Ligand binder design. Structure first.
Ligand SMILES: Cc1cc2nc3c(=O)[nH]c(=O)nc-3n(C[C@H](O)[C@H](O)[C@H](O)COP(=O)(O)O)c2cc1C
Ligand SMILES: Cc1cc2nc3c(=O)[nH]c(=O)nc-3n(C[C@H](O)[C@H](O)[C@H](O)COP(=O)(O)O)c2cc1C
Ligand SMILES: Cc1cc2nc3c(=O)[nH]c(=O)nc-3n(C[C@H](O)[C@H](O)[C@H](O)COP(=O)(O)O)c2cc1C
Ligand SMILES: Cc1cc2nc3c(=O)[nH]c(=O)nc-3n(C[C@H](O)[C@H](O)[C@H](O)COP(=O)(O)O)c2cc1C
Ligand SMILES: Cc1cc2nc3c(=O)[nH]c(=O)nc-3n(C[C@H](O)[C@H](O)[C@H](O)COP(=O)(O)O)c2cc1C
Ligand SMILES: Cc1cc2nc3c(=O)[nH]c(=O)nc-3n(C[C@H](O)[C@H](O)[C@H](O)COP(=O)(O)O)c2cc1C
Ligand SMILES: Cc1cc2nc3c(=O)[nH]c(=O)nc-3n(C[C@H](O)[C@H](O)[C@H](O)COP(=O)(O)O)c2cc1C
Ligand SMILES: Cc1cc2nc3c(=O)[nH]c(=O)nc-3n(C[C@H](O)[C@H](O)[C@H](O)COP(=O)(O)O)c2cc1C
Ligand SMILES: Cc1cc2nc3c(=O)[nH]c(=O)nc-3n(C[C@H](O)[C@H](O)[C@H](O)COP(=O)(O)O)c2cc1C
Lengths: 185, 176, 176, 183, 185, 176, 183, 183, 176
């Protein structure tokens, strides 16, 4: 299983780091990371990790301006892509198909190859434009997994919420997060 | 100021309790609470409070089946409504106009009177139907304020995230 | 009052410079300027001023690449935004939501927060694409105030036409 | 070349007058003028000219209520039409196809024959209805040429703006008015 | 507060007269009336007032063919417009934007300036065209306030129904009709 | 039977005159004629008749400006309406609902009451706008019976073509 | 000039024949004819001519089933196409893009190359499906020219109507057939 | 004739080079080239030529970031534009109207002036977003000319395919490159 | 594996012949060929082969008129279908659902059963109609794999271009 992990400059960099950490604990999974310029800023602000620390969580890390990277090619097989978190700018770019950098190009390629795209859109409030773009991509089979907190499993800390979101994102690829707190009835 | 607060059976009952607690501190605000049947289950499961405790946080607590409540009529003036959290079922009913209980009727009335409606939709993932319904209501000027965690202010506890969302919902009505 | 003034590389930088001069005559208004890269080219070709001169007309002048500026945050309260003049490319980015820089990000934020956005779109002719984008934004309550000459008040000079457009743009925020 | 020129009651009668003057200097262009009722009001308020003065600038002048004029039939060949300036009411009538007078009829005819219609829409602000109407006609190949002032060529007077607008309108028919290059 | 009051040739002229009467009793409110040709006919048929009697209820009255009236200009500030009753022809004109007379022009101007437009559409049955036009304008924020009778407050006379409609129309401008019979529970 | 016959200023007044002559041969049919201003021009250019002659072919001839005529009321029962011929402008007014005169008002009323409307649209070529308007009305059950020549029955004269169109128009109301 | 002329099984074979005769009088126009199967039936029933007679009126006559004809490729340059008259079935095939025979293929080719397609649609009444199909092609710049009789020029015979229709069809290609003025 | 030629970072730089060479053989055609950043990468990887070599094939070469170039204004008359090959990113930018660089701007200008835009879209497979974008521009009269190989004329080399594509692109402007007939 | 391979009369019969040759090198794949009437013309003009030669490349070759063939039944399990090359007319028939022959019927069945359909659409230029039909089918999950030349791997011959297209078509079914 080869997964692309795009990270983007929406607040919620801890979500990306945690997903990358959980992926690192699965040996059957090769990860290709692309951090946008603004994701690097957000990682540094919101987590104790640097961008290089996060890059080291992945098997491969590609430059966001590098349209000649492996994952820019359709013939280079992957099982899909997660953008976490996904900003409104990146969301809008993917919907329009304006593949100006590698996050956008890798996403455009994933879609043309029929591979799974999972977005973790984060913004509040959501406007009509945000919702239009989300719907357009949803109709195409793109999974929309905003980081909405669950309270039924009695979370206490931010980590509790992050890990639940990560588990529910991973569900999209039939992957089992080993600390998921699921509904029992 | 008169505000309708709808509570609904989406996970996130602490979101609604906290908004009610904040509003309680504002004497200038008259609150009209409508807890759905499933919001009572979610409150009692996810909070240390009972439905009756939450009811006591509001100036009025209308029965979710009472289509004869003051707020069911457009002639009764309010400043608008918040549904927090808002389930996909309730969202869908509002979009369709299928006003079969008081949460749905109050919302339909708010919309027909040109009053402010603010929804706190909570579901994950969001499907095509959810997004269709959300989009259609957004085009009508309904505020969509999902409980999206912000990390730029370095939250530590669930209370931190809850506090942030409530502050932003309050913002929709110029409240601090 | 807090107003964001975006300047964009459409011909008509004198419209933007004149608006900022008129705002500087109002001591109660805090102005946040964002000049695009091409707006600087246009200012220097069409006005007596340099980019620095125009920057000095506003309380703040943010870098058009700086997505961390105050006005990129929703929680930072403003009374809205004017893009004057507004090129088709900027208009297109806003309609699409492709918030690549601060003009785009500030606009996207103004819209999500339900604040007032006023665009001064300048292009001739207007293509199908231009009108599509204008129509979509208009349905959302975005004011479209193109710099259309009025001849009923018998203008004589360019300044007369400029002044009239500015006053009507100002009029959107109930200003004289 | 045969061109229909419609004038309409939006502010900007000076734009229509200057177009007719520019077309008057071109011998192998036959102009057919239709001034709307409210255009006469706008001409007289905004220019030093009377209605008859403006009518004299064109080869033919047709009554706005005359649905039996030459230009109201598609069998009468022309090279197209300019409405300058074009009010929101006239723009809406054309979009709807409600051809109540000659301006609407001629425009409707130009469209059905597949000839070139150029509109000079003027209103501010532009509402949702305005934009909807403009977009629907744009999709049909109707040129939308609002009188948007250019500043890159350093205008000083109203005339500078008016003549530039006229030049860019004329461009639609490949006609040269007596521009951007490098920087 | 400056309000434009358009009247139109749908049955229901008593609704217009009553709204104008109620407005006359509010000194903070300047009214600009435009009666269509057919409204004049309807006023004379349905009320004991003449058109001039109704004109005298307003602070200003403009000619329906007068595209040069104050209210035809956007720069002339008003707080909005009510068309009461609003015929299907007038409704259709406003939706198409075919601003052929002053009722239509003043309405078109109100919409371009972002001011409040309140329509009191009256026709029965409603056809697909009526409904299309009503919806198009509704999506733009135009208030659709058809004169539908309420029976919960136990009306007895036509006046009872007229005054309730008028009160509910006035609600659109935050104005208080002093004889409103509101729902008490 | 009560039928409204609208005449409109499209070329093809002989189609309208012939329809009225054929109806006058049916003693059970009460005809309500409304000739538009331009229909009078067309009748006088294309037929041997004057406006008065054509008016005398029907039981009633209402003034095209008279919005108070019997047929302007829905409660006044009719079996429907034919517009023959129907110009694009009249077709456009009906589709838009801009019922400025009696032809338009009578049509708008026929539609709201669910009565049968038959249009004989005449124009060549048919533009996008014309087809839009025709399609919209067609979706509502409005019959579109343009005066299309049939050559299978070997016509020789204009009257043969005219007669065939009239019979097929008549056929809409199960008439011979 | 190279023009494709398609004929189709709507009533109005006399319209197609008269178009070919008018084009035959024009030396610098090369006509390519495609008669549909049902058009041959309509020609023989409605005219004094046989199928071969009509084929002789054109420079080239292609089999309606021949998808290998010159006109079935976009590399073979023409100035466009007229389908006269055009049945609802053929109109629907073109709209759908279901280019089963040469009439549909040539029309599909004309469209993809951005050349001028003119249709002479004939049916009565017109249904919702007819109008939908006509509208969709109209939006793409396809001229819709139904054979609508004009009466203002005082016709007496069927020929008068036929020749006027032909003249107005030819107008689409700027060709003059051997009209409205004033009143 | 004045033609804008845009080159873009889709595979198929040989297609753009061959178009410029073919246009170079035509004296009364003035070509304005705009190579995108990624097009230079594609040229160098896929051809024996450098960026400067290709720029020398055109009369004018404009920087892709230069929004002040002659071709960025509608007052500067051209006969239209070819983007060859056209990436999905550039195709999407044009459709959206997001005219961030000169390729997008010139294309946006060509469209607003009603001049002819021809795109040579290349990607495989084509996604829903690609097709949506292509369709929206097609509706506006933008020619969509993907580099689809023909086999009926029996090609042997890559050059055979390239030159046929070029010929069919040129067809859009009525230019003859130095085809199907019968069977 | 069971694969349906439709061949259609677009130029590019060498693409279809090459695909069938590549499949014949895979012993686990049962191929069901349907050559259209015009595909036979194209094969004989563009390849060294006759229709019989191409038929012999597949396990089954069904008559393009035979709506009773095995693959016309949904209950007959397959892994999907490739149309290579796919003309605009065939593409149009599939999008419309006008399943007049076996290529159309087999495709309509593949879609109703939720099996994979891969079209190799070949035409230049692509008109509005072509793109409409392609877009509609694409929204349903139909893969659009037009024979687009790739120059990054430095091809020299027609066979190089052909081979690359085939491998990417194959790639849709996870084949080499
Ligand atoms: C600290 C901070 C927080 C931000 N949070 C969000 C957010 O949650 N949602 C969003 O759409 N953009 C957010 N942005 C704005 C984006 O970072 C900006 O639009 C940027 O251009 C995104 O580019 P990228 O998607 O390529 O990373 C934030 C920016 C800053 C600096
Ligand atoms: C503990 C629990 C959590 C739930 N969370 C959600 C949720 O997050 N989003 C949602 O749409 N529905 C959620 N539901 C399901 C809704 O309660 C259910 O659709 C119900 O019909 C909603 O009715 P109501 O909106 O009137 O309260 C949840 C149910 C349970 C019991
Ligand atoms: C002098 C000159 C005049 C221009 N005028 C316009 C114009 O009026 N409308 C427009 O959309 N673009 C115009 N542009 C092109 C834009 O500058 C270009 O699209 C640029 O990318 C806009 O970027 P921005 O919106 O961030 O400023 C002009 C460019 C130049 C230099
Ligand atoms: C002097 C004055 C200025 C006007 N300016 C405009 C204008 O700028 N745009 C517009 O749409 N209408 C404008 N109008 C209103 C129109 O004249 C009015 O809608 C009229 O019905 C148009 O009719 P017409 O298009 O047949 O001329 C103006 C009216 C007056 C008297
Ligand atoms: C007495 C009478 C009652 C009418 N009632 C209505 C009605 O309720 N609804 C409607 O749309 N038109 C009604 N009309 C028809 C309109 O008056 C007619 O369409 C007229 O053209 C409207 O023009 P106006 O809107 O400019 O006044 C009525 C007409 C008459 C004479
Ligand atoms: C002799 C002549 C022939 C006309 N023929 C047509 C026609 O066939 N189709 C059309 O839409 N308008 C035609 N018109 C133009 C209309 O008469 C014009 O649009 C008029 O405003 C229609 O108004 P009415 O529908 O109320 O009669 C013709 C006009 C003249 C005088
Ligand atoms: C003599 C007769 C008259 C016909 N007239 C028409 C007609 O007016 N309009 C139409 O759409 N079809 C008409 N048809 C039916 C068509 O001929 C039939 O749909 C046929 O399949 C058309 O095929 P084609 O377009 O390939 O010629 C007529 C058929 C017959 C035999
Ligand atoms: C050699 C290689 C081949 C590429 N081929 C294509 C292609 O076939 N189609 C496409 O849309 N993008 C292709 N790309 C990706 C684009 O180059 C990338 O999206 C870039 O941002 C396009 O920018 P531009 O249109 O300004 O040149 C390719 C990239 C590389 C490095
Ligand atoms: C040699 C030649 C090449 C053709 N090339 C194409 C083409 O590339 N695209 C297309 O849509 N049709 C093409 N056709 C036309 C089709 O063969 C025609 O539309 C036929 O009806 C298709 O039917 P089918 O899809 O059942 O094979 C070509 C025809 C000939 C004979």
């Amino acid at each position: 299983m080869k997964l692309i992990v795009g990270m983007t400059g929406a607040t919620g960099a801890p979500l990306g780091v945690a997903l990358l950490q959980a992926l690192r604990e699965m040996p059957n999974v090769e990860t290709h990371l692309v951090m946008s310029k603004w994701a690097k800023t957000t990682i540094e602000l919101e987590t104790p990790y640097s961008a290089r620390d996060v890059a080291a969580l992945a098997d491969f890390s590609h430059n966001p301006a590098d349209q000649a990277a492996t994952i820019s090619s359709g013939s280079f097989r992957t099982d899909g892509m997660i953008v976490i978190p996904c900003s409104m700018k990146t969301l809008a770019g993917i919907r329009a198909g304006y593949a100006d950098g590698l996050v956008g190009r890798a996403a455009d390629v994933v879609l043309k190859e029929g591979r799974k795209l999972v977005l973790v859109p984060r913004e509040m409030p959501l406007s009509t434009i945000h919702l239009e773009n989300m719907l357009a991509l949803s109709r195409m089979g793109v999974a929309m997994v905003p980081p909405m907190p669950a309270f039924y499993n009695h979370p206490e800390t931010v980590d509790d919420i992050v890990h639940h979101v990560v588990a529910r994102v991973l569900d999209q690829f039939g992957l089992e997060h080993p600390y998921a707190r699921r509904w029992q009835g």
